[PDB]
C-alpha cells in the first residue's frame, strides 16, 4: 500500500502528561475556587465528586477508550460506528473554530502583562500613567481615604483602560476597532503553538513537558508565599466554611455537574486523538483515573493558592472575602490578584511567574484542542492531506488568528463572555450528549465492554457499564436542560447585556451543529432502497 500505518507516542509519560496538560487550564485555577466558595463552601466537595465519579469519569474513560481502540480521528471514527453521526466530527471542528476565537486572546492578555512585568516598577502600582483617570486612587498614598462609587484602583485602571482598552467601546453594538498590541501578542502565541504542533504528536508530547510541569511549581511558590501573608486564614475560612443548606438547592448540583464536565473536557474528540496514538494493550483505566484525579486535586490546591492571597487582600482591606471576590472571571486574576501581587516584596518575580503560569496553563490545552481537530481532518482526508502536516496546521492557525480579530477589538471581552456562555458551552454539551447517546444506545454498550475486554483483557465492571447505559447521558441531559430552561443573565464590567444576546449566542451555537442533521439527511437521501435499509447501513458499521 501507499501508507501503511500511523504514528505513536514517544513515551508513556509524554502523553500521560499531555492529556493532563490538556485538562489543566485557567478554569481549574480560578473558576473552581470561586464556585466552590459561593456554593456550600467546603461542603461543595461532596457533590463535586459525585458528579465526577458518576458523570465525569465514565465520560472521560469512555471517550478515552474509543480513541485507543479505533485509533481514528473525531470524524473518521464515526464512519466506523454510526456514519450518519459523522457530522459530529465536523461540528466539533466548527465548534473548535469558535473556541479558538477567544481562549487564545486570554493568553494574549497574560502575555501583554508578562512583557509589561519586566519594569522595576510595575505599571498597575502607581496611579500616574497615560491611561489613568482622576478617579485613580492607589496605596502608599494619604491615609483616611474613603472609596467612592466612581473611584477605581490603579490595577482596575490598568486592565480596563490600557491592555483591554474596553473604555473605547460602547458594547456589542460598537466594539471597533482592533488593538494591535494584543494582535502581536496573540501572533506570538499562535507562533508558539505552531512549533509545538506542526511536527505532530512528537513535539506536542515534548513541549507538554514544560507547559504541564511549570504551573505546579508556580502554584507551590505562590502557595508558600500566600501562606506567609498575614490574615490569609480569612480566605481559607471563607473557602472551606461548610454551608449545608446549599445542597438542598437544585442549582448547586447542576453547577458541579457542568464544572466537572467542562473541567475534564470529554466528548470533544481531543482525548480521542490523544488516545489514537498509543499502545493497543496499554491500560486505559489507570490512565484516565490518574489524569482525572490529578486535574481535580490541581483545582483543589489552586483553591488555596487563590484564597490565601484573597484572604490577605481581605485582611489589608476589611474582611468580607465575598466583597473582594465579588467579581468572578479574569478580573479576579488580572486585577484583584495582580493588585495583591504589586503590594508584596519581589513583586516583579511573583508577577512574572504568575503570568507565565497563566500562559503555560492555556498553552497545552490549546495544543490538544487543535490536536484533536488536526488529527480528525488528517485521518478523515488521508493522503489527500498529510502531504505536509505543517501546511494543514498553519492553515488552521492562521484561520484561528483571523477568527480571533473580533476578540482583539476594544469590546472583545463582551464577545468572550457571549461566545463562551451562550454559544460554545451549550453546543459542546450538546455534541457530547449526542456522542454519549450514540456510543451507548447505537453501537451498543455490550460491544463496547467487549472491546475493553479485548484491550485490557477483562470486561469493565458493572459499576461502569451502568454508568454508560444510564448515568452519563442523563448527566449531560440534566445540564443541557438546566441551561436551556433558564439561560443566565450576562453582566460584565458594570454593563448589562442586551436582551437579544441570547438570540445571537444561540444563532452562533445552532450554526455550529447545523452539519449533523443535514448530513443525516445527506446519507438518508443518498442510500438507495427502503429507508429501513438506509438506516440499517447507517446503524451497522462500515
Amino acid at each position: 500500500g501507499s501508507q501503511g500505518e500511523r504514528e505513536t507516542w514517544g513515551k508513556k509519560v509524554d502523553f500521560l502528561l499531555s492529556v493532563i496538560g490538556y485538562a489543566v487550564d485557567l478554569g481549574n485555577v480560578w473558576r473552581f475556587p470561586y464556585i466552590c466558595a459561593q456554593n456550600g463552601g467546603g461542603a461543595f466537595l461532596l457533590p463535586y465528586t459525585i458528579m465526577a465519579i458518576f458523570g465525569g469519569i465514565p465520560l472521560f474513560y469512555m471517550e478515552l477508550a474509543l480513541g485507543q481502540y479505533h485509533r481514528n480521528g473525531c470524524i473518521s471514527i464515526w464512519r466506523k460506528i454510526c456514519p450518519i453521526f459523522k457530522g459530529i466530527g465536523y461540528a466539533i471542528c466548527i465548534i473548535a473554530f469558535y473556541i479558538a476565537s477567544y481562549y487564545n486572546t486570554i493568553m494574549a492578555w497574560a502575555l501583554y502583562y508578562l512583557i509589561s512585568s519586566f519594569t522595576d516598577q510595575l505599571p498597575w502600582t502607581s496611579c500616574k500613567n497615560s491611561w489613568n483617570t482622576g478617579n485613580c486612587t492607589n496605596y502608599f498614598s494619604e491615609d483616611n481615604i474613603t472609596w467612592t462609587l466612581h473611584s477605581t484602583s490603579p490595577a482596575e485602571e490598568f486592565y480596563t483602560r490600557h491592555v483591554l482598552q474596553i473604555h473605547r467601546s460602547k458594547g456589542l453594538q460598537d466594539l471597533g476597532g482592533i488593538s494591535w498590541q494584543l494582535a502581536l501578542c496573540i501572533m506570538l502565541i499562535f507562533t508558539v503553538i505552531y512549533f509545538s504542533i506542526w511536527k505532530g504528536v512528537k513535539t506536542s508530547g515534548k513541549v507538554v513537558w514544560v507547559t504541564a510541569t511549570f504551573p505546579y511549581i508556580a502554584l507551590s511558590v505562590l502557595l508558600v508565599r500566600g501562606a506567609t501573608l498575614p490574615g490569609a486564614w480569612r480566605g481559607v475560612l471563607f473557602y472551606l466554611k461548610p454551608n449545608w443548606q446549599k445542597l438542598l438547592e437544585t442549582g448547586v448540583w447542576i453547577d458541579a455537574a457542568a464544572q466537572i464536565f467542562f473541567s475534564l473536557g470529554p466528548g470533544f474528540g481531543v482525548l480521542l486523538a490523544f488516545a489514537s496514538y498509543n499502545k493497543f494493550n496499554n491500560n486505559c483505566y489507570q490512565d484516565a483515573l490518574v489524569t482525572s484525579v490529578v486535574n481535580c486535586m490541581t483545582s483543589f490546591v489552586s483553591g488555596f493558592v487563590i484564597f490565601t492571597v484573597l484572604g490577605y487582600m481581605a485582611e489589608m482591606r476589611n474582611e468580607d472575602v465575598s466583597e473582594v471576590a465579588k467579581d468572578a472571571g479574569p478580573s479576579l486574576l488580572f486585577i484583584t490578584y495582580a493588585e495583591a501581587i504589586a503590594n508584596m516584596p519581589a513583586s516583579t518575580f511573583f508577577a512574572i511567574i504568575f503570568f507565565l503560569m497563566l500562559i503555560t496553563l492555556g498553552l497545552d490545552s490549546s495544543f490538544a484542542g487543535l490536536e484533536g481537530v488536526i488529527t480528525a481532518v488528517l485521518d478523515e482526508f488521508p493522503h489527500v492531506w498529510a502531504k505536509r502536516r505543517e501546511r494543514f496546521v498553519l492553515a488552521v492557525v492562521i484561520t484561528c488568528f483571523f477568527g480571533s480579530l473580533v476578540t482583539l477589538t476594544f469590546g472583545g471581552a463582551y464577545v468572550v463572555k457571549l461566545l463562551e456562555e451562550y454559544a460554545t458551552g451549550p453546543a459542546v454539551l450538546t455534541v457530547a450528549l449526542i456522542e454519549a447517546v450514540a456510543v451507548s444506545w447505537f453501537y451498543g454498550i455490550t460491544q463496547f465492554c467487549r472491546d475493553v475486554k479485548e484491550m485490557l483483557g477483562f470486561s469493565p465492571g458493572w459499576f461502569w457499564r451502568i454508568c454508560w447505559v444510564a448515568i452519563s447521558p442523563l448527566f449531560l441531559l440534566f445540564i443541557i436542560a438546566s441551561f436551556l430552561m433558564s439561560p443566565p443573565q450576562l453582566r460584565l464590567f458594570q454593563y448589562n447585556y442586551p436582551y437579544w444576546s441570547i438570540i445571537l449566542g444561540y444563532a452562533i451555537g445552532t450554526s455550529s451543529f447545523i452539519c449533523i442533521p443535514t448530513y443525516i439527511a445527506y446519507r438518508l437521501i443518498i442510500t438507495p432502497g427502503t429507508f429501513k435499509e438506509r438506516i440499517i447501513k447507517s446503524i451497522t458499521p462500515e
Partner: antibody
Amino acid sequence: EVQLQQSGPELVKPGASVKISCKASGYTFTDYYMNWVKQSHGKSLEWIGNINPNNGGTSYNQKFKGKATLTVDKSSTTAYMELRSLTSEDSAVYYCTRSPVRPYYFDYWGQGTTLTVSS
Amino acid sequence: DIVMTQSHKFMSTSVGDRVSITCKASQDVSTAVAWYQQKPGQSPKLLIYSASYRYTGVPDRFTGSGSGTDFTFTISSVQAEDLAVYYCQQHYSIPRTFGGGTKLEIKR
C-alpha cells in the same frame, strides 16, 4: 452643609402602603450610596438596604426582602422608600443616611420619619 | 449574619470620669467597627470609624480601640452634653448589623 431632609410623619391603616422621601444636599449626589435604617421604639438600629443613585442599583437585607422597595431620582436628587403590607411592628422611626463604598459608614443621617400603622 | 452583642445595656458614670463601652461581635472583625452617638430625639451621629480612627467634626475626647471580636469606645472627660445612646456596628460583611446599644447615665 450636607443635609438629608426626609418627609413628615405618616399615619396609615394596616394593610396599606406608605412612601418616605429623602432630599440630599451639600454633596455630590451620584458619589454615595443612599441607605435606610429602621429604628423601633426602644430598640436598636436595623439596616434595611442601600441603593446606587447612578443606576439605582438596589441591595436589600434578607430580613427586609420583599418588604421595602428603594428608588432614586437624579433630577431632584431625592431617594424614596416604599413599604407595603403594614403592621404594628412597622411603627417606628425611619432614617435615610449617606454612606460611601468603603469603609462603609453612615456619615450623615436624615432627621427621621415617625411612622404609625393603626386603624 | 453577624451578631453585635453589647452585654451592658446601661452604664453609670460621673462628669469628668473615664468611661468605656465594650462591643462583642460574632466572628473576627479585624479593624472594622463604627461607633455612633444618638442623642434623645435626634438622628444618630457618626463618631468613630474603623477601630481607632475618628470622623471629621468629632472632638478629641472621643477615642476607640481594639482589634478582634471585642472593641472598646473610650471617653476621657464626660460632659453634660455627652448624654446619649451609643451604638457599635460592623461594616465588613453584608448585612451590616448593630449592637443592642448602651444608654450612658450620668451620676451626680
